[PDB]
Design a protein around this ligand. Structure first.
Ligand SMILES: Nc1nc2c(ncn2[C@@H]2O[C@@H]3COP(=O)(O)O[C@H]4[C@@H](O)[C@H](n5cnc6c(=O)[nH]c(N)nc65)O[C@@H]4COP(=O)(O)O[C@H]3[C@H]2O)c(=O)[nH]1
Ligand SMILES: Nc1nc2c(ncn2[C@@H]2O[C@@H]3COP(=O)(O)O[C@H]4[C@@H](O)[C@H](n5cnc6c(=O)[nH]c(N)nc65)O[C@@H]4COP(=O)(O)O[C@H]3[C@H]2O)c(=O)[nH]1
Lengths: 121, 267
């Protein structure tokens, strides 16, 4: 909704990415990432159940993998927006490194972490 | 441990972070600094203090928990290449300037300083003029700990031979070691946004930029690599991560075969 304020900064990103659900797997084109979600292109044969969780795998180079449980937030005109739900410590540590390096200011990262830890206050 | 299990609950409930039940050791290491400054004497007290919800303590905990530290002498072979090929190549020619980009907790620039010292001890005063290592990252607590040069048991328990530990570190009480001041003096730490201009950095014989460009898009990392090329003296070398290739810059960089691994010569 247009009156809402985005909590986290979205970063244009293009790492090799997949979406998983059950036994299903889709290669997807990544568009952006944030500390709390991703934007991907809708793949072929998209029968992903929108009411059930998905998993995203972002391949950073050859030997770094960011894994996150995601929920479908919105879908339209060939795009899929996902919200991060659960993420392992190593994956969020890589994600935090990505976000801080692309923000270029550690204090902007701290404000993002402040919004993340207080989201369910 | 009950306190540790409650901490796992905190991380999941607040941020959705899933902490394995096998990471008590990692929690203690990453929160040691913060608990010291905060006057907190146990994880259990930390868990009590973080229920709430006001203040910036919860952010500081998540901050410390999500910072990765780098490894000592990461991959081994780039430092052998440095001592066996690059430094002899440069001596056949002047103060040495090395850029350690995105130095994180400092393990790489201090590893470079130790490798330089090992070369200088086995090779005369062949490095007549001296060596300067410029180590850069974003300002904050991680770069601040790099400057301090102090490391805990977890950081010291891997990648460092007992020969190097005795030769290059000072014990600083239980479970802490500091890089020896002579080794630290070679390194100068600076705050630098890799997305900003490198004009203030001067020129380098060598750039180490390892396992960092994976955090940038294809277009952004190409621009960083192009501007890194501007900081290299002619014929200088760029070191990437062991699994990193340099994409779409054939006129600027020439791959050079090492034994094993590769480095990139600035054309
Ligand atoms: N349900 C949902 N849909 C999303 C979200 N993000 C993006 N979209 C969809 O993607 C379209 C384009 O987003 P945009 O490129 O960021 O470009 C957007 C964006 O830049 C801006 N905008 C609109 N609303 C907001 C907002 O609440 N916050 C911010 N920071 N920008 C907004 O206006 C442009 C067009 O907005 P739209 O017409 O709404 O069309 C949006 C919207 O349909 C989201 O978090 N939730
Ligand atoms: N990296 C990334 N993450 C994404 C993207 N889209 C959604 N998310 C994540 O999913 C969360 C929920 O989106 P929402 O439920 O639609 O609810 C959204 C949405 O309703 C509204 N909103 C924000 N931006 C737009 C927009 O451009 N268009 C529209 N129609 N709504 C927007 O604000 C709410 C909160 O936005 P957020 O705080 O950002 O929180 C977003 C965001 O963290 C994306 O394209 N990239």
């Amino acid at each position: 909704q247009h009156d809402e304020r985005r909590r986290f900064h979205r970063i244009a990103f293009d790492a090799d990415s997949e979406i998983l659900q059950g036994e299903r797997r889709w290669e997807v084109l990544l568009h952006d990432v944030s500390l709390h979600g991703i934007l991907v292109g809708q793949p072929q044969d998209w029968n992903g159940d929108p009411q059930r969780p998905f998993e995203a795998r972002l391949y950073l180079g050859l030997d770094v993998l960011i894994r996150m449980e995601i929920s479908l937030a919105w879908a339209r005109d060939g795009l899929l927006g996902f919200e991060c739900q659960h993420i392992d410590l190593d994956s969020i540590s890589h994600l935090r490194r990505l976000v801080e390096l692309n923000l270029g200011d550690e204090e902007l990262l701290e404000r993002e972490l402040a919004l993340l830890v207080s989201a369910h206050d | 441990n009950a306190d540790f299990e409650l901490f796992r609950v905190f991380l999941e409930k607040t941020c959705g972070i899933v902490l394995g039940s096998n990471k008590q050791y990692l929690v203690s290491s990453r929160l040691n600094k913060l608990m010291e400054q905060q006057g907190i004497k146990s994880l259990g007290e930390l868990v009590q203090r973080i229920q709430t919800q006001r203040g910036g303590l919860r952010e500081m905990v998540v901050d410390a928990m999500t910072t990765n530290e780098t490894l000592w002498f990461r991959d081994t072979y780039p430092f052998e290449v440095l001592k066996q090929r690059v430094l002899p190549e440069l001596i056949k020619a002047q103060r040495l300037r090395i850029w350690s980009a995105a130095c994180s907790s400092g393990q790489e620039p201090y590893s470079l300083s130790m490798a330089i010292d090992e070369f200088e001890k086995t090779n005369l005063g062949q490095l007549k003029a001296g060596v300067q290592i410029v180590a850069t990252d974003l300002s904050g607590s991680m770069l601040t700990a790099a400057k301090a040069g102090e490391y805990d048991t977890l950081a010291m328990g891997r990648g460092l031979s007992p020969e190097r530990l005795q030769r290059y570190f000072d014990a600083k009480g239980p479970g802490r070691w500091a890089v020896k001041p002579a080794i630290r003096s070679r390194v100068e730490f600076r705050a630098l946004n890799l997305l900003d201009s490198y004009a203030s950095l001067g020129k380098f014989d060598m750039v180490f930029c390892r396992n960092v460009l994976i955090y940038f898009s294809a277009e952004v990392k190409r621009d960083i690599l192009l501007r890194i090329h501007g900081t290299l003296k002619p014929g200088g070398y760029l070191f990437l991560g062991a699994s990193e290739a340099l994409n779409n810059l054939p006129d600027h960089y020439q791959m050079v075969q090492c034994s094993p691994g590769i480095i990139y010569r600035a054309k």
